[PDB]
Design a protein around this ligand. Structure first.
Ligand code: AC6
Lengths: 300, 237
């Protein structure tokens, strides 16, 4: 179990760690988060009390380094940093644990939610979507645009998700126009899986990462990407059987975790009604269809 | 965006454009089987691709053999239409290719867009107007060439005959729309109007009769009248 210490908490802020959150008052004696489970990526995220504008946060993996948080009063935000001096970091953390100034990552032992939301998410792949190679951790916020969004404007601050566009030459073989538009199996299996992602794990990882950025930061372009990657699978007549069963599990836990009052903005009516009721895979998502019908019947 | 009453004059500017109507591409006669079921038999159809400014009509005849052994024909018909329009554009010299293609039915947008991916600078547009282009098969010479076809064929016409020698394309296109509206609303009476007088003939190289300017005024008047004679008979007014 690993620890992310906080220098201090100089402004009032709601702090999130994965699906957990807590409120910290102005200058409250908060010095970080302990007992973070090893083996998964994590995201620490922030919403200031005074300006709920700009949710922002950091994806990180405690296996890759010792990371801490420090408020910057010039740039006005909590920044993640890496400590290169190991004995300094241990002496800092140990002092903070002794004075009990840290919250405990509050994982229930039965509970596999975070694993199921991040099963295919790797730090190495996050760092290629979010390019800032001098850090081991990745910053994301509410306003960052995706490469595809910037085609339709600052490149360094972009989410480089894989561009998916159903009316594009990449998606449509010359002479297979109708076939490829109405059955996207070519585009899914050859262009994207064999060509770009290499395997279904990397595809699902990007899909899961897009969802988490949509949910935790309200990132609109991440939501577009998540829905596009669902739709590409559901609109393919030919999908490996293991991918369909895994997809049902992936979506089930995403829909299960979504705050009930954010569905109006985070869920695209057309995509879900097409995916669940009209597409080739209308019958392949039993778990997702059951939870969607019992939890968001209005959208449908 | 969409083509409507507000931007009607854009039809007659000097940017090349084409309308595409797919109404008459897939044509069937529904009938009873010996077992008392219902079946369709296809008949030859056509794509109606027309330039508003010049009157040039690219009539691609769709022979019934294109449907043989195919499923979901009404869907296929839209993609076949889009394939043939794309082929037509590719066959034209660059300086003759359209800058815009206006489809009369919105279900043609995605099929045509996908087939025209190679032409990112050709705008594909819908229209809010309810044009009577379906009535093209009420023009006797167009109907005759379609039904006689034994194989796929493209036939070129000028749907305005020689009218542009005397009137603008705005009036030429507006005259074509009024004649087609009449043929769609009551074909028999419309055709009676156009041919009642044995002394006005259709030239071999034309589609419509050789009316004088004064006679066209009269002819347009009975068509405007006929579209009201029907609209009353229809709504009781
Ligand atoms: C089609 C038609 O009847 C018509 C009439 C007047 C116009 O100025 C334009 C079109």
């Amino acid at each position: 179990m690993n620890t992310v210490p906080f220098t201090s908490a100089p402004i009032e802020v709601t702090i999130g760690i994965d699906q957990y959150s807590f409120n910290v008052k102005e200058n409250q004696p908060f010095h970080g988060i302990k007992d973070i489970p090893i083996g998964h990526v994590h995201v620490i995220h922030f919403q200031h009390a005074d300006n709920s504008s700009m949710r922002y946060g950091y994806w990180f993996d405690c296996r890759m380094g010792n990371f801490y948080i420090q408020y910057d009063p010039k740039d006005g935000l909590y920044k993640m940093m890496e400590e290169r001096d190991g004995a300094k970091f241990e002496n800092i953390v140990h002092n903070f644990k002794e004075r009990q100034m840290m919250v405990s990552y509050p994982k229930i032992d039965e509970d596999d939610t975070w694993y199921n939301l991040t099963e295919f998410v790797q730090m190495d792949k996050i760092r290629k979507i979010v390019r800032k190679d001098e850090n081991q951790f990745s910053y994301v916020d509410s306003s960052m645009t995706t490469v595809q969004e910037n085609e339709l404007s600052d490149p360094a601050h972009s989410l480089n998700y894989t561009v998916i566009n159903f009316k594009s030459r990449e998606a449509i073989r010359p002479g297979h126009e109708m076939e490829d538009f109405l059955d996207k199996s070519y585009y899914l299996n050859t262009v994207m899986l064999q060509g770009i992602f290499k395997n279904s794990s990397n595809y699902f990882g990007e899909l899961q990462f897009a969802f988490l950025n949509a949910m935790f930061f309200g990132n609109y372009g991440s939501s577009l990407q998540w829905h596009a990657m669902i739709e590409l699978i559901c609109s393919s007549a030919t999908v490996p059987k293991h991918m369909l069963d895994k997809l049902d599990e992936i979506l089930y836990y995403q829909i299960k975790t979504l705050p009930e009052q954010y569905s109006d903005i985070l869920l695209n009516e057309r995509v879900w009604n097409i995916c669940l009721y009209s597409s080739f895979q209308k019958n392949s998502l039993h778990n997702t269809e059951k939870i969607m019908e019992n939890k968001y019947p209005e959208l449908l | 965006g969409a083509m409507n009453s507000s931007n009607y004059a854009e039809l007659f500017n000097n940017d090349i454009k084409l309308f595409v109507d797919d109404t008459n591409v897939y044509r069937v006669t529904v009938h009873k089987t010996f077992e008392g079921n219902v079946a369709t038999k296809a008949i030859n159809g056509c794509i109606f691709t027309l330039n508003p400014k010049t009157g040039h009509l690219f009539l691609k005849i769709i022979h019934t053999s294109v449907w043989a052994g195919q499923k979901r024909l009404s869907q296929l018909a839209k993609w076949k239409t889009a394939e043939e329009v794309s082929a037509l554009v590719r066959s034209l010299p660059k300086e003759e290719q359209p800058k815009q293609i206006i489809v009369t039915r919105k279900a043609m947008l995605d099929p045509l867009e996908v087939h025209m991916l190679d032409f990112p600078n050709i705008a594909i547009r819908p229209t809010e107007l309810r044009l009577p282009f379906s009535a093209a098969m009420s023009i006797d010479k167009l109907s005759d060439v379609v039904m006689k076809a034994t194989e796929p064929q493209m036939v070129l016409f000028n749907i305005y005959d020689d009218w542009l020698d005397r009137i603008s394309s705005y009036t030429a296109f507006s005259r074509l729309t009024l004649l087609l509206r009449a043929l769609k609303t009551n074909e028999e009476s419309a055709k009676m109007i156009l041919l009642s007088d044995p002394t006005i003939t259709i030239k071999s190289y034309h589609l419509w009769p050789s009316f004088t300017d004064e006679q066209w005024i009269t002819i347009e008047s009975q068509m405007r009248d006929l579209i009201l004679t029907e609209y009353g008979r229809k709504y009781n007014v």
